[PDB]
Design a protein around this ligand. Structure first.
Ligand SMILES: *[C@@H]1O[C@H](CO)[C@@H](O[C@@H]2O[C@H](CO)[C@@H](O[C@@H]3O[C@H](CO)[C@@H](O)[C@H](O)[C@@H]3O)[C@H](O)[C@H]2NC(C)=O)[C@H](O)[C@H]1NC(C)=O
Ligand SMILES: *[C@@H]1O[C@H](CO)[C@@H](O[C@@H]2O[C@H](CO)[C@@H](O[C@@H]3O[C@H](CO)[C@@H](O)[C@H](O)[C@@H]3O)[C@H](O)[C@H]2NC(C)=O)[C@H](O)[C@H]1NC(C)=O
Ligand SMILES: *[C@@H]1O[C@H](CO)[C@@H](O[C@@H]2O[C@H](CO)[C@@H](O[C@@H]3O[C@H](CO)[C@@H](O)[C@H](O)[C@@H]3O)[C@H](O)[C@H]2NC(C)=O)[C@H](O)[C@H]1NC(C)=O
Ligand SMILES: *[C@@H]1O[C@H](CO)[C@@H](O[C@@H]2O[C@H](CO)[C@@H](O[C@@H]3O[C@H](CO)[C@@H](O)[C@H](O)[C@@H]3O)[C@H](O)[C@H]2NC(C)=O)[C@H](O)[C@H]1NC(C)=O
Ligand SMILES: *[C@@H]1O[C@H](CO)[C@@H](O[C@@H]2O[C@H](CO)[C@@H](O)[C@H](O)[C@H]2NC(C)=O)[C@H](O)[C@H]1NC(C)=O
Ligand SMILES: *[C@@H]1O[C@H](CO)[C@@H](O)[C@H](O)[C@H]1NC(C)=O
Ligand SMILES: *[C@@H]1O[C@H](CO)[C@@H](O)[C@H](O)[C@H]1NC(C)=O
Ligand SMILES: *[C@@H]1O[C@H](CO)[C@@H](O)[C@H](O)[C@H]1NC(C)=O
Ligand SMILES: *[C@@H]1O[C@H](CO)[C@@H](O)[C@H](O)[C@H]1NC(C)=O
Ligand SMILES: *[C@@H]1O[C@H](CO)[C@@H](O)[C@H](O)[C@H]1NC(C)=O
Ligand SMILES: *[C@@H]1O[C@H](CO)[C@@H](O)[C@H](O)[C@H]1NC(C)=O
Ligand SMILES: *[C@@H]1O[C@H](CO)[C@@H](O)[C@H](O)[C@H]1NC(C)=O
Ligand SMILES: *[C@@H]1O[C@H](CO)[C@@H](O)[C@H](O)[C@H]1NC(C)=O
Ligand SMILES: *[C@@H]1O[C@H](CO)[C@@H](O)[C@H](O)[C@H]1NC(C)=O
Ligand SMILES: *[C@@H]1O[C@H](CO)[C@@H](O)[C@H](O)[C@H]1NC(C)=O
Ligand SMILES: *[C@@H]1O[C@H](CO)[C@@H](O)[C@H](O)[C@H]1NC(C)=O
Ligand SMILES: *[C@@H]1O[C@H](CO)[C@@H](O)[C@H](O)[C@H]1NC(C)=O
Ligand SMILES: *[C@@H]1O[C@H](CO)[C@@H](O)[C@H](O)[C@H]1NC(C)=O
Lengths: 429, 127, 121, 438, 122, 432
């Protein structure tokens, strides 16, 4: 009874490695291999292999690569260090400010007196007609460079040789635990890298119901990642009519200032249908009570507090960054028509919670519109002592990795070890 | 296709191991920026892994062959199951989980047995 | 030379197959050199893998068990190996290779399963 | 007959790859590998091939390589962003001889020193093409309406040296050897060489400089010569020797603009000033145009009159003849060099003219302030080529006017990489043999 | 022993430990030092393995060849080589006359392979 | 007889390769992989430390890593401004007087429009009189960066380990001459750990010799080649800077800071350094005892101080604590051979250009508080002169100036070999 050696038998162990893009603006589509068409699937019909939503290297590599690529794409154009000057600002016609200052020209001796429109959120008062921007005591950062776009182009991560990526197909798969069905694929679907806070939008829908996913459900420190079944459509506008003028700073670098308002100034607002949101919240509260008690009071409040990026729903509609209040959505109690939202716009941006480098977004002329579907929520829990039956579930966010854990949950990467041995009564001679 | 019959029996997966091995090196469709150095690292790591897998088959006298045999005895403390129930109703993934500890000594027995066999083969050619 | 017998007799170019097979291995000039060397290594390892899976590894010439078809080449041996170069041959058969590759792989797969049970006595 | 497998048969197939260069500077040689002593060459006797010169990826790869090497080299140099001030300039008057009335402007401007809160008053002579009149008079530099740009470091040299694009491991560079070779069409005599010859990266616009002389007749090469919008490349048999020089005697003064950087400027002329005159022989050019019209009549009509003229573009880099004599950029006439109507020892003096702010490689704003070079400059160079462009004229007594042209820089490198195409070898092959396995 | 533990051992004693030397040949911008040496080691290993594979000699460490020993390379007897010498000196006095061996083995294997298919053609 | 081919033989040849870093900050240990010995019995092998190649790769790697460590810090371009300076005379010591200068200048704030008036303290080695108005000494060659206070100059050990296919051979000879045959060679995966300290005349925190004092030279007859001395016992020194500097933050622009010396809380004294008298006397006695073998018996050996030149080469220069000392060490090399403590006065310079380069310096920020510091003196770099022959008198002066000789005192027992595992041999077999 002597050892025989087999080469190429299918076994795998889980491992961490570096992936690469594939595709057909900021997100580097042109540096990717073209996609691989109709990858066939298999069926491990006798498997009990555990999946893990929360402890894979896929989302970490996604976040690191998106941050590094954002830092790469911001480089080869204008940096606005001489705009940090004193400002003399008044009121228009009380949110917008009419600021006039002194700036350099393309000649090094001559100077000009130009004016621009600045919002309230990105100016502070220095000691009532002497202002400055809020980034002057922390950074000196880069204008968004007006040829690139911020459209979420689809990106497929495709695995090198020696590694394959699997695909969980279980319908009631909560992200952690041994799923009863494991398939494979060559590489992934069209993950769109949107940026969001407490309203996941433009994503993948669910299969039969609305799932509730967490580390443990009995801890008020882990986010509950709700994914919708039916798409809830949100659509909005900026009703102002901005004009863009080109103020030249120096030898070949310009500054795109906000001009005058052509029409009438009205605040930006994003509204959603009342009955659709009511029935979707009803589905969420119907299937969410199975983890917290069958006779409980579920009441929805607004955001807790902190910075403006985590308190408010922040998204990017065509180049203007909205910071909508979303307090008229999460206000209900549960016991056994359009909802408009006042929304404000900020120009200078700290995107990935980083201190030391901001981002200036230029104004875009005309009215801007976008239709989109809400496909997820990032509810948290504010717990208490066990003396009352009410449960306080305030929405939250700010952690960008939870956005890309909404996708890539039915994906894990394995490493193939083709060598294997077996007992046999055959002999080499 | 790739990883086909990975949940089937041990005997039926022995007829399939010629299609896993074609994609251990590369695909032909996948043959400066963030992506390029990452893909180059992936290619060099795949080449290193394939060469490391081929070296062990080179040492044990099994080079160029997929299924082969060796002249080392199988100690019964490694496994007590007989031939009838190991090639039928047993998956390769369930088979790997009990030679987690015992692989590093059977590899040494393989290389020592092949070295002794090669010395003995070279001894008889001198006559 | 390197491949100076490319236009020669096909039977006479089989002598010099060794010296063409030794040369598959050999900051602007940084990652470019690296990519070229990795691509050459990938092509040579792909060729050696395709030799190994068909069972003809370690040999520049190998002889197999796949029957030749009259539809692939109606020309007899008196013209292929006497007055016809490898370039004209490969231009003639460039669209007929994949079927022959699959048949060689199938013959090698069927050959090995009839040898494992032969030594089990 | 049975299927047998062969490894290493001489079978090639066309592809593209990343080549590399070797040699024995603004073109970085110290990053390249050294080349071999006693190089090799392999002749493929008794073989055919279907070369094409107008669709090589070698040319685009070379253009990308030269652009990358040129942009890499100027990166550790002085940026000169304090340089354009409101210049106050007066004309030079002192040794003007007739023709340079109004071309050298003596400018006075003031500038940041090593220290930050202190200004120094300096002066420099600038050419007229580098100053634009903002409304003595107030001038400014031409560059900082579009971009501020980098002074070349005074240690790198713009002299072309030969580079040799080698094949990578597993590929082949195929070389043509048929003399009368059109480009598009078969080459009966094909050779395999592991490296190209000494292609010199020379920059010219109308009258292609130092290079390979054709050895057959003068060759007129194009891809759709019938069409009226394709550049017509002409290669000569005998070289046409051309003199160009700068009679002025410049002196460098070094202005310190910051803590570490410096700006080399023109000083004062020690001597008298005259135009940079370019010479070419009457008889040699007459004979060369005679050979060109002789090989042009057959193809363009067996009884034609052939008219030559001068350029009609608007930018200064296509209507002139730019080159790199010594380190000073010339921008010359070529109009009196082409005033002839061919029907069925003197010297032509060309006014060559010098500009310092250089927008080359046809990009909209990355210039280069070329440093002044001290002393007179003299170049002796070979005319080996010519770029022509036919008009939109149809008929009327077979009169075709062949004005000069240029523009795109790829045409200077398809006059040297025409007898080259990269292929990959595919060693796998199957054939009938009497064999069976045992 | 270890990686090079038999460097002081004789010719006949270091011949039984070639496996431990054959096994260990294939074991933030300035991280390219870790990447270039791996490609160099891969190219060196493929050069050595291909040079073994030309001679009809690959897949085995102790490999025999039917080429006779020309005495002009070395004229000493076999008796005092394999038990009174180590591998370092046997590299030193065959530092020369090696490239001729590396070509005659190439031609011998090619003529043996030619013998192989024309023996099997009949 | 018939030719056989053996693959995997134990032979090697000398070669040059790229060695990767390995570690257990200014020295970036993030790129280094995290971190064994086999004895060889009957091998003797030629060694040489002066034609070595790990020392040059080490020195170039240290220079390039030091350069990439200072990339994202502040450039300090607008500090090149016309200083207006006077002396400082808060109760100054009569020896320390003049050295510290009060200074004041105009410089920009975070807003581009406005400006402020900021005062600071500078040394005499940092300021040059304008020909009272002064200026910085770096505003004449190249304005240079400031060291970030997040990183520190602690010399963490690093290992250089050869890649696959190469081996590192280590001598175990207890009396190694530096060159010549090595009687016992032991291979290793890689080295024991080298602390990349910087010094000029006296080696600090190095590796001791194990049995007696080693003296190594490329050519002991030639005067132009340095002499390396390695100890068997350590000599202890005290770094000392008895002041209370106050670092204050000055904002130079939108997001950048300049840390300047604000004021001294207390008395201002000299920054001395202390070495023991009896231990140095015994160690120098061992040195002069075991230097007489290469030069001859009954020869008068005397020690003089450094000859001259710039401040870095002539004087002892170390970097303990965080600031850069420049010690006189003229009271050490004074004897003539037929609980006291030697105090050496040292002076501090802030603008530092380390690896003998022009146009590339570095500003060192002040360290708040008082600096207490100790280190071992485990080696010296001596330099003789071309005295007259048959005079029986040789003068030895401490040299230095080059940084290669500091790390050549640690990579003296290592060399890199290239494994070629292919070999041929005759054996009576045949092929069938
Ligand atoms: C979620 O996805 C939808 C659909 O992909 C996004 O709506 C799209 O938004 C973009 C950006 O504003 C619109 O592109 C713009 O449209 C017009 C005409 O093309 C013009 O102003 C611009 O040139 C630009 O192309 C696009 O039309 C719009 N699509 C539809 C069908 O309305 C939506 O923005 C995404 N939600 C996000 C990113 O939060
Ligand atoms: C090289 O360019 C010349 C330009 O002189 C091309 O000749 C012209 O080609 C165009 C486009 O094919 C022809 O126009 C159209 O062609 C067909 C009939 O040939 C028909 O659709 C239209 O009636 C129209 O004419 C044009 O006739 C033709 N000739 C002339 C005298 O202008 C030529 O095809 C190009 N050569 C190659 C090899 O592509
Ligand atoms: C075509 O090739 C000729 C080859 O001689 C090139 O002429 C050479 O140009 C270089 C660069 O200016 C001259 O070198 C310089 O010469 C003197 C000392 O002789 C001195 O100023 C410099 O140290 C430098 O070496 C060289 O003399 C000159 N040779 C001749 C014979 O004129 C010519 O430039 C090429 N044509 C081009 C690039 O358009
Ligand atoms: C030679 O090695 C000695 C250690 O034996 C080095 O002395 C060490 O000097 C550093 C200076 O940065 C001290 O670290 C710092 O100390 C204090 C807390 O004590 C604080 O400022 C920092 O957090 C930091 O840890 C270290 O304590 C000190 N070791 C001692 C006194 O035992 C010496 O610098 C080395 N010599 C050279 C030339 O590098
Ligand atoms: C190309 O043509 C040559 C002739 O130049 C051919 O050489 C023949 O080779 C055979 C075989 O040795 C000789 O018997 C003939 O006398 C040769 N000449 C003929 C047929 O004219 C050869 O077939 C081709 N050779 C190459 C190297 O490509
Ligand atoms: C979740 O929280 C509970 C309650 O504190 C705790 O006991 C449990 O360990 C947590 N779950 C995990 C997986 O850590
Ligand atoms: C997820 O489901 C598995 C069973 O499929 C269960 O063991 C596990 O506790 C669930 N996790 C959570 C957080 O509810
Ligand atoms: C915008 O959404 C509302 C519901 O919130 C819907 O009634 C309306 O038709 C939408 N407008 C579009 C799609 O233009
Ligand atoms: C939600 O809207 C987006 C944007 O128009 C669209 O791509 C998506 O298909 C919609 N989802 C549906 C219809 O389920
Ligand atoms: C193999 O090694 C591990 C680690 O020491 C040990 O825990 C385990 O019990 C061993 N396996 C067996 C099957 O004994
Ligand atoms: C200076 O030169 C300009 C440019 O041609 C000309 O218009 C002007 O008249 C000149 N002035 C004098 C005084 O020569
Ligand atoms: C180029 O010459 C070849 C050689 O015969 C010929 O086939 C082809 O037609 C020519 N092309 C042109 C455009 O003259
Ligand atoms: C133009 O050509 C005529 C002859 O055709 C000649 O007289 C005249 O000089 C030419 N012009 C130049 C500038 O040579
Ligand atoms: C070293 O030499 C001695 C004496 O010849 C011998 O006994 C010993 O075995 C040798 N060592 C090895 C490792 O072969
Ligand atoms: C042996 O080698 C020598 C070279 O020294 C050569 O001349 C000779 O032909 C070879 N063969 C024989 C059989 O002597
Ligand atoms: C080897 O042969 C060469 C032939 O040139 C000779 O120079 C050399 O001395 C010989 N011996 C050694 C040990 O290299
Ligand atoms: C020891 O080193 C000295 C100084 O370099 C040298 O002169 C001497 O020859 C060496 N001796 C030996 C035995 O290597
Ligand atoms: C030394 O200076 C520091 C500066 O932070 C101060 O806090 C401390 O009290 C001083 N110590 C003295 C004077 O002993």
């Amino acid at each position: 009874l002597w050892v025989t050696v087999y080469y190429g038998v299918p076994v795998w162990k889980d491992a961490e490695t570096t992936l690469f893009c594939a595709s057909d603006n900021v997100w580097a589509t042109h540096a990717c291999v073209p996609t691989d068409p109709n990858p066939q699937e298999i069926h491990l019909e006798n498997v009990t292999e555990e999946f893990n939503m929360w402890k894979n290297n896929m989302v970490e590599q996604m976040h690191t690569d998106i941050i590094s690529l954002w830092d790469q794409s911001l480089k080869p154009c204008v940096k606005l260090t001489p705009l940090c000057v004193t400002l003399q600002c008044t009121n228009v016609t009380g949110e917008l400010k009419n600021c006039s200052f002194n700036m350099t020209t393309e000649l090094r001796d001559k100077k000009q007196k130009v004016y621009s429109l600045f919002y309230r959120l990105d100016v502070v008062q220095i000691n009532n007609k002497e202002y400055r921007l809020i980034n002057c005591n922390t950074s000196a950062c880069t204008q968004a460079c007006p040829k690139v776009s911020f459209e979420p182009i689809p990106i497929h991560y495709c695995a090198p040789a020696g590694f394959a990526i699997l695909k969980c197909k279980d319908k009631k798969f909560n992200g952690t635990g041994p799923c009863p069905s494991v398939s494979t694929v060559q590489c992934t679907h069209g993950i769109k890298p949107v940026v969001s806070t407490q309203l996941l939008l433009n994503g993948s829908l669910a299969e039969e119901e609305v799932m509730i996913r967490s580390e443990n459900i009995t801890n008020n420190a882990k986010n509950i990642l709700v994914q919708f079944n039916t798409p809830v459509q949100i659509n909005c506008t900026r009703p102002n009519n901005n004009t863009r003028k080109s103020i030249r700073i120096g030898p070949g670098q310009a500054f795109y200032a906000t001009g005058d308002i052509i029409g009438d100034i009205r605040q930006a607002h994003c509204n959603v249908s009342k009955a659709t949101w009511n029935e979707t919240l009803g589905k969420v509260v119907k299937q969410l009570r199975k983890h917290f008690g069958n006779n409980t009071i579920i009441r929805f409040a607004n955001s807790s507090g902190g910075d403006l990026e985590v308190t408010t729903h922040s998204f990017n509609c065509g180049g203007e960054f909205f910071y909508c209040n979303t307090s008229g959505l999460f206000n209900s109690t549960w016991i056994s028509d359009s909802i408009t939202l006042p929304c404000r716009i900020k120009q200078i941006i700290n995107m990935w919670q980083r201190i030391g480098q901001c981002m200036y977004a230029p104004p875009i002329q005309g009215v801007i519109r976008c239709v989109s579907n809400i496909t997820g929520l990032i509810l948290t829990r504010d717990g208490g002592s066990t003396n009352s039956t009410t449960e306080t579930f305030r929405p939250g966010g700010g952690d960008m990795r939870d956005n890309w854990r909404s996708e890539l949950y039915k994906y894990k990467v394995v490493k193939i070890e083709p060598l294997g041995v077996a007992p046999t009564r055959c002999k080499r001679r | 296709g790739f990883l086909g019959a990975a949940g089937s029996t041990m005997g039926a997966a022995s007829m399939t191991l010629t299609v896993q091995a074609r994609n251990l090196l590369s695909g032909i469709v996948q043959q400066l920026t963030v992506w390029g150095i990452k893909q180059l690292q992936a290619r060099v790591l795949a080449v290193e892994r394939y060469l490391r897998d081929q070296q062990l088959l080179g040492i044990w006298g099994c080079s160029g062959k997929l299924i082969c045999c060796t002249n080392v005895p199988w100690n019964s403390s490694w496994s007590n199951r007989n031939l009838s129930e190991i090639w039928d109703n047993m998956t390769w993934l369930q088979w790997d989980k009990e030679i987690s500890n015992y692989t590093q000594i059977i590899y040494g027995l393989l290389e020592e047995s092949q070295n002794q066999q090669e010395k003995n083969e070279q001894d008889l050619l001198a006559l």
